[PDB]
């Protein structure tokens, strides 16, 4: 029967994950039964229903009272405690925690859910220290059922890794540089304010803001042959969702743009179906809102020089497309549960 | 003889105040000697110098070490403690604390700076409970030197009150409604997230966000005859700075637009000089960045119906113009200490 | 028996109207058979389908060739001529032209479609000179079948008029002031550039831009008792769609907020059903995208002072909601042809 | 004595060029004596003074009447005719026309100023057909005084070329890929509307909008050895000014990031002084508003992989920094006038 899931942190990814699940609920081995977050159920039900990015939730009615959120008559219990050791995970029979607060990404932090009584934790971010990292359609079939804490990597990693995997197998990637032009996120400031990163301190909707990203090194964890071969940066720009990666590879087998495109297109129809989408259309970021693929290759931006320098460009919905992946990873753990 | 000032909360208002003071430093009875804020001096020196709104600070070099910010060789001591009772105000000889955190606006909260040793507190926001409230050019000459905690009201109140005072004296305001179309502030969320106010919870740069404001009631505290006669709302919109108030008054003496304009123009040249500016130009918000006035009356938007229903519209730089007024209030307290 | 419609100007309103019609196509007495626009059918089919505001059109497939757009197998003929006298309206048997270019709003301009052979014109904007003006749910039942050129007013007028009509009938409006805080439109510039209006010349997504509006005077054309009693302004702000009107009325019968709210709620359930929606929710602009009502009253912002000064605030999707009303006006003309 | 200049097209670049000149007026061999534009002098004086990006012009008073704009008592004559053959260039003794309309970039278009009586034209954009192209600090000393029509290339080309020139000379560029994350410009639409380019048709302040750029191929015109070796794209994003280029080169001489940085820094102090600025600061786009350099290298984003794959990142103020270059090219033509 059902794997009982709790969401810790009812943020952009927490609530996108909940909306993904509510739309895939008839096929699922998961049942979302609890939420912990720093605010109350009435606030959270309001935000779950009224989303500036996704619009008004249509499929089912959403209400709340002092201790539950109700979404189509399914009652989701709510609690509010910043310290996960205190959570009622044993009492609610929680099997799997979706860890989406952004502050419990190390094994020591995420373990406190295990102390509270949960059996497994899926971190919706890169892990700190050695937490196994999975990207669906790249390495998720290597999942080991005895693992109690996993990571679903970052949005950028989920866009980049499948593309790198297709190219590496067809051409042999020797080295690779990435830049993601990425929507701002809640980690940045609305107006100039203190932050650990002096660039992220700056008014996010007024600026182009460079920042580091672990996505390119993290690709080497999910494609171990490429460990150390990729590097990259991010530019945060004044859009609220939808991001784009630009990837430039030095490859071994000499090629041209038409063949790079053909190889990706062929993978998008077969081995990476549902993960990579191949687009020949002349679209912009708003058109990819709500797209279910991890990466949408923009085929007419592909270019190659001298045989060996290859550039591809791919879109991703960093909230929604990532949340669909978290749900897929979760369903996969549910189907291989021990 | 210099009044020693500490800034508590080195945010948009705290740092705007500091820049205002650094530019008026030769005339001043204040000396900023300390800052308390939740982050460190290097971060704060970087933010003081590199401002998305004001630009790069030009006049003087700004550096920092582990415990000071240096702004043109003037050393400003820094500490970092969330609880103001712990602050070293007696040890630094602090006379006046500029309370700019947004979280110590009641008397009980602001009094903790007095417990820590400061002699007076100027809150950069409306006071909760009865804290005397001053708007420079409206009632600051009623300031009483024995008051230990005061409020400089909100940016919106500083824009609205002087205009109300001029109109009330010329025409007799019986009732009035305000809407401010206001730049977003740090109090709102960048992307939809939890907040006390369900509207402020929503992505600030993507939405028009209505929200309540006490600015219209607060005008009744600084013009006591109008207590209970005014009300209003705010609309937060996707600009980072510069705001506009739209005020509709029911007045006693019948009038027309040209006369309403003339009365405010006259006050802008005499009693409200430096507080109200009168503009006949067709300008937009970005042209008011850095403006020193509390209100800039946009004269061609003035309209009157039926003699008695009067609408005026006025701009304000909610960060800079307000901070100039905090500095003026502070210099006034300094002069009457 | 179908009324054959051509769209002149396939802009934001033209394409919103087309999408509105494609979704209400089974109930309709209209058939859209032609489009004239300054660009070509492939470009226009791409823009019809891929909309930054409405999203990707889902219901039906949309394709194009050199001379038609196809939307669910329905073929819409396309031509491209700036001068409406040259248009092939007799050759296409056009009954009704939806005039959405923004440049043929006088009778002389709109009459050129009649010269070209159309039998009637519905202008998607206020008329210049005396063109009969209709607001659905306020005066559309006064439409006279012999009129050959009509106006559906502006988005702001469609939001304001129904609320004014309800309030006037319950309390007696003596005078009223409006400000609309309005999304930018294609009429403004992306970056500072030449324009007839020096304010609209300025970068629209960086500024609050005041501008005049005839919406408040135009309410007097559709509620003739209020002619000359209303005035207002607009503030354009950096959102791409969804607008809000703030209306302050001086009324004859003394009242309070709860009663003003109740009267509008009651009208929203009966006489203004589908035209005014009454909302008690704490929502922001992006939540009103796609709303079908002409006005959405935001009930908790309602305030009253002194019995007689009443403020209400109402939302409108200026592209979609307005286009639903153009379609309703058109269906009404169709039913009375 | 003075070269008499007219500005055709009083747009973002036309008015930025005018403000650059008003601030460098005491040193100059140019005198701006006329403007042609599609609107009137009162509108244009208003826009010259009140700028959403540059702020209120401070140095001098600016007024207008029916036929002049006055800027500090200097009277600039104004006319308004879309067709440059009709312009009064002989009657005003115009030597040099700054062609900033964006619509007269071919030799046939720009020549009509010569028919009207001007002696030379400087196009503030890439030329169409063979118009000599100059980038100050890369090839402007090759200027030939007998040329009657020239191009000052694009903003992106002025940022990229000097950097490519420094790298090519130190490491030998074999191939190179560029992406510019670029502020929107007046060429894009405010809300979705018809455009020759289906991506630029889309609401510029709401979208990330890919688009082609000739900047990378144009580098091969100013550095002829690299002709055919560079390619690239642009992403337009919702900021109104300030842009960033990300350049990834395959080089011949193996290197590391510290040495790439050192070479650029050394050029910024010597041969490219005033053209390339080397920044070690953690800044964002708004901080580079008004910067006079063509390219500001963001040194801590530099990275190298495998010796031969080099990535650098540089900022530019696409309006102001480009306009300073146009003024420099003009002053250079003035000092070598025939
Ligand atoms: N584009 C994206 O937004 C994106 C994509 C992929 C991964 N991620 C990652 O997902 C995680 C969450 O990101 P987000 O964008 O939802 O941020 P967010 O700030 O919207 O969500 C964080 C939520 O957790 C709550 N929270 C914080 N501390 C808590 C605690 N101690 N206990 C309970 N709740 C707490 C916050 O109030 C908020 O509701 C981060 O790790 C982020 O790196 C984000
Ligand atoms: N337009 C405006 O921004 C504006 C105008 C007028 C008045 N105000 C008022 O000024 C005050 C601050 O506004 P802001 O816009 O500067 O906010 P902000 O968040 O930018 O500034 C608050 C600063 O204080 C710090 N802080 C928070 N808690 C603290 C504590 N316990 N101890 C020390 N520092 C702490 C924050 O880290 C930040 O540096 C508020 O009362 C606000 O309502 C703001
Ligand atoms: N919020 C709104 O957008 C809104 C709301 C209500 C009413 N309106 C009114 O609707 C009308 C159009 O507004 P819009 O926002 O759709 O503008 P828009 O610029 O998007 O649309 C105008 C369309 O007509 C085309 N056009 C221009 N001249 C033409 C000609 N001579 N012949 C054929 N086509 C021509 C343009 O190329 C464009 O496709 C205006 O009268 C406007 O005031 C707009
Ligand atoms: N970032 C930038 O803005 C940038 C940087 C480098 C180069 N450029 C290039 O500079 C040129 C102008 O760009 P811009 O951003 O100033 O655009 P813009 O639209 O602001 O300026 C064009 C000006 O010329 C006017 N105009 C158009 N046709 C005309 C005609 N036939 N006669 C007279 N005036 C006419 C327009 O009204 C406008 O004032 C373009 O060629 C552009 O590619 C732009």
mmCIF file of N, CA and C and ligand atoms in Angstrom, chain C residues 191-194, chain D residues 7-16 36-39 44 47 79-84 87 99-105 123-126 152-156 158 182-187 236 240-243 316-320 322-323 326, ligand 4:
data_model
loop_
_atom_site.group_PDB
_atom_site.id
_atom_site.type_symbol
_atom_site.label_atom_id
_atom_site.label_comp_id
_atom_site.label_asym_id
_atom_site.label_seq_id
_atom_site.Cartn_x
_atom_site.Cartn_y
_atom_site.Cartn_z
ATOM 1 N N UNK C 191 11.510 51.838 -23.991
ATOM 2 C CA UNK C 191 12.549 52.687 -23.471
ATOM 3 C C UNK C 191 12.229 54.108 -23.893
ATOM 4 N N UNK C 192 12.708 55.123 -23.146
ATOM 5 C CA UNK C 192 12.353 56.550 -23.444
ATOM 6 C C UNK C 192 12.452 56.857 -24.949
ATOM 7 N N UNK C 193 11.339 57.231 -25.581
ATOM 8 C CA UNK C 193 11.319 57.585 -26.989
ATOM 9 C C UNK C 193 10.155 58.503 -27.279
ATOM 10 N N UNK C 194 10.218 59.184 -28.398
ATOM 11 C CA UNK C 194 9.224 60.122 -28.799
ATOM 12 C C UNK C 194 7.776 59.621 -28.704
ATOM 13 N N UNK D 7 23.428 64.883 -35.958
ATOM 14 C CA UNK D 7 22.928 63.600 -35.491
ATOM 15 C C UNK D 7 21.638 63.308 -36.249
ATOM 16 N N UNK D 8 21.611 62.194 -36.955
ATOM 17 C CA UNK D 8 20.394 61.731 -37.562
ATOM 18 C C UNK D 8 19.811 60.578 -36.709
ATOM 19 N N UNK D 9 18.654 60.797 -36.103
ATOM 20 C CA UNK D 9 18.041 59.830 -35.178
ATOM 21 C C UNK D 9 18.421 60.163 -33.736
ATOM 22 N N UNK D 10 17.540 60.846 -33.041
ATOM 23 C CA UNK D 10 17.784 61.313 -31.673
ATOM 24 C C UNK D 10 17.169 60.339 -30.666
ATOM 25 N N UNK D 11 17.639 59.063 -30.757
ATOM 26 C CA UNK D 11 17.155 57.916 -29.959
ATOM 27 C C UNK D 11 18.013 57.699 -28.709
ATOM 28 N N UNK D 12 18.057 56.465 -28.215
ATOM 29 C CA UNK D 12 18.853 56.173 -27.038
ATOM 30 C C UNK D 12 20.325 56.473 -27.325
ATOM 31 N N UNK D 13 20.841 55.985 -28.460
ATOM 32 C CA UNK D 13 22.237 56.219 -28.826
ATOM 33 C C UNK D 13 22.459 57.673 -29.272
ATOM 34 N N UNK D 14 21.566 58.225 -30.072
ATOM 35 C CA UNK D 14 21.663 59.656 -30.397
ATOM 36 C C UNK D 14 21.759 60.635 -29.200
ATOM 37 N N UNK D 15 20.894 60.435 -28.243
ATOM 38 C CA UNK D 15 20.878 61.283 -27.051
ATOM 39 C C UNK D 15 22.001 60.936 -26.054
ATOM 40 N N UNK D 16 22.348 59.661 -25.878
ATOM 41 C CA UNK D 16 23.540 59.301 -25.058
ATOM 42 C C UNK D 16 24.797 59.961 -25.698
ATOM 43 N N UNK D 36 18.415 65.769 -36.818
ATOM 44 C CA UNK D 36 17.240 65.389 -37.512
ATOM 45 C C UNK D 36 16.636 64.212 -36.785
ATOM 46 N N UNK D 37 15.337 64.254 -36.605
ATOM 47 C CA UNK D 37 14.641 63.151 -35.955
ATOM 48 C C UNK D 37 13.165 63.217 -36.318
ATOM 49 N N UNK D 38 12.450 62.125 -36.131
ATOM 50 C CA UNK D 38 11.038 62.119 -36.483
ATOM 51 C C UNK D 38 10.168 62.935 -35.535
ATOM 52 N N UNK D 39 10.621 63.332 -34.348
ATOM 53 C CA UNK D 39 9.765 64.247 -33.615
ATOM 54 C C UNK D 39 10.324 65.671 -33.491
ATOM 55 N N UNK D 44 12.132 66.486 -27.964
ATOM 56 C CA UNK D 44 13.483 65.998 -27.905
ATOM 57 C C UNK D 44 14.305 66.651 -26.793
ATOM 58 N N UNK D 47 13.322 64.839 -23.588
ATOM 59 C CA UNK D 47 13.917 63.550 -23.443
ATOM 60 C C UNK D 47 15.396 63.647 -23.242
ATOM 61 N N UNK D 79 15.563 69.611 -37.486
ATOM 62 C CA UNK D 79 14.661 69.442 -38.614
ATOM 63 C C UNK D 79 14.027 68.072 -38.422
ATOM 64 N N UNK D 80 13.031 67.789 -39.216
ATOM 65 C CA UNK D 80 12.327 66.524 -39.097
ATOM 66 C C UNK D 80 11.917 66.005 -40.480
ATOM 67 N N UNK D 81 12.740 65.167 -41.062
ATOM 68 C CA UNK D 81 12.417 64.535 -42.341
ATOM 69 C C UNK D 81 12.969 63.125 -42.382
ATOM 70 N N UNK D 82 12.093 62.171 -42.637
ATOM 71 C CA UNK D 82 12.473 60.783 -42.655
ATOM 72 C C UNK D 82 13.410 60.422 -43.778
ATOM 73 N N UNK D 83 13.405 61.196 -44.851
ATOM 74 C CA UNK D 83 14.196 60.858 -46.018
ATOM 75 C C UNK D 83 15.475 61.704 -46.013
ATOM 76 N N UNK D 84 16.649 61.079 -45.765
ATOM 77 C CA UNK D 84 17.875 61.872 -45.630
ATOM 78 C C UNK D 84 18.317 62.666 -46.856
ATOM 79 N N UNK D 87 17.689 66.402 -46.401
ATOM 80 C CA UNK D 87 18.183 67.119 -45.253
ATOM 81 C C UNK D 87 19.019 68.311 -45.667
ATOM 82 N N UNK D 99 24.939 58.545 -37.807
ATOM 83 C CA UNK D 99 23.788 57.926 -38.275
ATOM 84 C C UNK D 99 23.305 56.889 -37.241
ATOM 85 N N UNK D 100 22.286 57.281 -36.470
ATOM 86 C CA UNK D 100 21.759 56.541 -35.326
ATOM 87 C C UNK D 100 20.267 56.236 -35.396
ATOM 88 N N UNK D 101 19.710 56.119 -36.604
ATOM 89 C CA UNK D 101 18.330 55.766 -36.749
ATOM 90 C C UNK D 101 18.101 54.278 -36.741
ATOM 91 N N UNK D 102 19.121 53.530 -37.105
ATOM 92 C CA UNK D 102 19.013 52.113 -37.235
ATOM 93 C C UNK D 102 18.502 51.675 -38.599
ATOM 94 N N UNK D 103 18.156 52.582 -39.514
ATOM 95 C CA UNK D 103 17.511 52.156 -40.799
ATOM 96 C C UNK D 103 18.355 52.489 -42.042
ATOM 97 N N UNK D 104 19.525 53.090 -41.872
ATOM 98 C CA UNK D 104 20.370 53.508 -42.969
ATOM 99 C C UNK D 104 21.752 52.944 -42.761
ATOM 100 N N UNK D 105 21.842 51.620 -42.646
ATOM 101 C CA UNK D 105 23.103 50.950 -42.351
ATOM 102 C C UNK D 105 23.826 50.365 -43.579
ATOM 103 N N UNK D 123 28.147 55.313 -38.904
ATOM 104 C CA UNK D 123 26.964 54.550 -38.590
ATOM 105 C C UNK D 123 27.140 53.912 -37.199
ATOM 106 N N UNK D 124 26.161 54.132 -36.318
ATOM 107 C CA UNK D 124 26.245 53.644 -34.942
ATOM 108 C C UNK D 124 25.701 52.251 -34.802
ATOM 109 N N UNK D 125 26.157 51.348 -35.670
ATOM 110 C CA UNK D 125 25.631 49.980 -35.789
ATOM 111 C C UNK D 125 26.531 49.275 -36.747
ATOM 112 N N UNK D 126 26.471 47.944 -36.784
ATOM 113 C CA UNK D 126 27.143 47.246 -37.872
ATOM 114 C C UNK D 126 26.652 47.739 -39.254
ATOM 115 N N UNK D 152 30.803 51.931 -36.523
ATOM 116 C CA UNK D 152 31.410 51.712 -35.230
ATOM 117 C C UNK D 152 30.972 50.358 -34.607
ATOM 118 N N UNK D 153 30.451 49.445 -35.425
ATOM 119 C CA UNK D 153 30.005 48.072 -34.976
ATOM 120 C C UNK D 153 28.884 48.181 -33.932
ATOM 121 N N UNK D 154 28.657 47.114 -33.159
ATOM 122 C CA UNK D 154 27.604 47.044 -32.185
ATOM 123 C C UNK D 154 28.193 47.215 -30.777
ATOM 124 N N UNK D 155 27.335 47.339 -29.781
ATOM 125 C CA UNK D 155 27.806 47.399 -28.370
ATOM 126 C C UNK D 155 28.509 46.105 -27.988
ATOM 127 N N UNK D 156 27.925 44.976 -28.389
ATOM 128 C CA UNK D 156 28.490 43.667 -28.040
ATOM 129 C C UNK D 156 29.871 43.457 -28.655
ATOM 130 N N UNK D 158 31.991 45.820 -29.422
ATOM 131 C CA UNK D 158 32.931 46.678 -28.693
ATOM 132 C C UNK D 158 33.337 46.091 -27.365
ATOM 133 N N UNK D 182 21.840 40.331 -22.421
ATOM 134 C CA UNK D 182 21.781 41.692 -22.874
ATOM 135 C C UNK D 182 20.464 42.335 -22.452
ATOM 136 N N UNK D 183 20.541 43.568 -22.015
ATOM 137 C CA UNK D 183 19.368 44.324 -21.730
ATOM 138 C C UNK D 183 18.436 44.439 -22.948
ATOM 139 N N UNK D 184 17.123 44.559 -22.714
ATOM 140 C CA UNK D 184 16.261 44.802 -23.812
ATOM 141 C C UNK D 184 16.578 46.140 -24.462
ATOM 142 N N UNK D 185 16.215 46.282 -25.727
ATOM 143 C CA UNK D 185 16.386 47.549 -26.448
ATOM 144 C C UNK D 185 15.103 47.899 -27.184
ATOM 145 N N UNK D 186 15.061 49.105 -27.753
ATOM 146 C CA UNK D 186 13.874 49.641 -28.438
ATOM 147 C C UNK D 186 13.404 48.875 -29.680
ATOM 148 N N UNK D 187 14.268 48.061 -30.212
ATOM 149 C CA UNK D 187 13.989 47.116 -31.283
ATOM 150 C C UNK D 187 12.972 45.996 -30.833
ATOM 151 N N UNK D 236 18.062 38.229 -24.573
ATOM 152 C CA UNK D 236 17.557 39.495 -24.064
ATOM 153 C C UNK D 236 16.794 39.254 -22.793
ATOM 154 N N UNK D 240 16.766 47.268 -18.389
ATOM 155 C CA UNK D 240 16.676 48.305 -19.399
ATOM 156 C C UNK D 240 18.013 48.765 -19.945
ATOM 157 N N UNK D 241 19.110 48.408 -19.271
ATOM 158 C CA UNK D 241 20.472 48.800 -19.725
ATOM 159 C C UNK D 241 21.480 48.026 -18.895
ATOM 160 N N UNK D 242 22.651 47.863 -19.463
ATOM 161 C CA UNK D 242 23.785 47.068 -18.964
ATOM 162 C C UNK D 242 23.691 45.649 -19.377
ATOM 163 N N UNK D 243 24.762 45.175 -20.027
ATOM 164 C CA UNK D 243 24.759 43.840 -20.601
ATOM 165 C C UNK D 243 26.000 43.077 -20.203
ATOM 166 N N UNK D 316 29.313 45.411 -19.937
ATOM 167 C CA UNK D 316 29.303 46.650 -20.679
ATOM 168 C C UNK D 316 28.008 47.415 -20.539
ATOM 169 N N UNK D 317 28.104 48.751 -20.472
ATOM 170 C CA UNK D 317 26.982 49.606 -20.504
ATOM 171 C C UNK D 317 26.721 49.834 -22.015
ATOM 172 N N UNK D 318 25.739 49.110 -22.526
ATOM 173 C CA UNK D 318 25.449 49.099 -23.949
ATOM 174 C C UNK D 318 25.010 50.421 -24.523
ATOM 175 N N UNK D 319 24.466 51.327 -23.709
ATOM 176 C CA UNK D 319 24.156 52.645 -24.228
ATOM 177 C C UNK D 319 25.305 53.615 -24.075
ATOM 178 N N UNK D 320 25.782 53.759 -22.863
ATOM 179 C CA UNK D 320 26.680 54.805 -22.546
ATOM 180 C C UNK D 320 28.084 54.495 -22.965
ATOM 181 N N UNK D 322 29.035 52.341 -25.239
ATOM 182 C CA UNK D 322 29.044 52.379 -26.726
ATOM 183 C C UNK D 322 29.092 53.850 -27.255
ATOM 184 N N UNK D 323 28.272 54.746 -26.673
ATOM 185 C CA UNK D 323 28.249 56.113 -27.105
ATOM 186 C C UNK D 323 29.588 56.792 -26.860
ATOM 187 N N UNK D 326 31.615 55.812 -29.876
ATOM 188 C CA UNK D 326 31.204 56.535 -31.062
ATOM 189 C C UNK D 326 31.857 57.925 -31.053
HETATM 190 N N1 LIG E 4 22.099 49.293 -26.638
HETATM 191 C C1 LIG E 4 21.735 50.109 -27.626
HETATM 192 O O1 LIG E 4 20.686 50.828 -27.562
HETATM 193 C C2 LIG E 4 22.620 50.126 -28.844
HETATM 194 C C3 LIG E 4 23.983 49.921 -28.748
HETATM 195 C C4 LIG E 4 24.787 49.941 -29.872
HETATM 196 C C5 LIG E 4 24.226 50.187 -31.138
HETATM 197 N N2 LIG E 4 22.899 50.430 -31.226
HETATM 198 C C6 LIG E 4 22.349 50.786 -32.553
HETATM 199 O O2 LIG E 4 22.115 52.238 -32.588
HETATM 200 C C7 LIG E 4 21.045 52.555 -33.510
HETATM 201 C C8 LIG E 4 19.896 53.276 -32.826
HETATM 202 O O3 LIG E 4 19.490 52.490 -31.704
HETATM 203 P P1 LIG E 4 18.633 53.101 -30.482
HETATM 204 O O4 LIG E 4 18.678 52.119 -29.339
HETATM 205 O O5 LIG E 4 18.953 54.624 -30.300
HETATM 206 O O6 LIG E 4 17.128 53.047 -31.067
HETATM 207 P P2 LIG E 4 15.938 54.162 -30.839
HETATM 208 O O7 LIG E 4 14.737 53.606 -31.524
HETATM 209 O O8 LIG E 4 15.943 54.713 -29.415
HETATM 210 O O9 LIG E 4 16.506 55.426 -31.744
HETATM 211 C C9 LIG E 4 16.166 55.575 -33.139
HETATM 212 C C10 LIG E 4 15.811 57.055 -33.353
HETATM 213 O O10 LIG E 4 15.757 57.431 -34.767
HETATM 214 C C11 LIG E 4 14.432 57.901 -35.069
HETATM 215 N N3 LIG E 4 14.190 57.554 -36.474
HETATM 216 C C12 LIG E 4 13.717 56.398 -37.010
HETATM 217 N N4 LIG E 4 13.650 56.447 -38.356
HETATM 218 C C13 LIG E 4 14.092 57.658 -38.672
HETATM 219 C C14 LIG E 4 14.259 58.388 -39.919
HETATM 220 N N5 LIG E 4 13.949 57.776 -41.083
HETATM 221 N N6 LIG E 4 14.744 59.665 -39.818
HETATM 222 C C15 LIG E 4 15.062 60.275 -38.638
HETATM 223 N N7 LIG E 4 14.930 59.677 -37.438
HETATM 224 C C16 LIG E 4 14.447 58.402 -37.432
HETATM 225 C C17 LIG E 4 13.527 57.262 -33.997
HETATM 226 O O11 LIG E 4 12.365 57.992 -33.780
HETATM 227 C C18 LIG E 4 14.420 57.327 -32.766
HETATM 228 O O12 LIG E 4 14.453 58.660 -32.194
HETATM 229 C C19 LIG E 4 20.556 51.220 -34.031
HETATM 230 O O13 LIG E 4 21.195 51.085 -35.289
HETATM 231 C C20 LIG E 4 21.007 50.204 -32.980
HETATM 232 O O14 LIG E 4 21.216 48.944 -33.551
HETATM 233 C C21 LIG E 4 22.102 50.387 -30.118
#
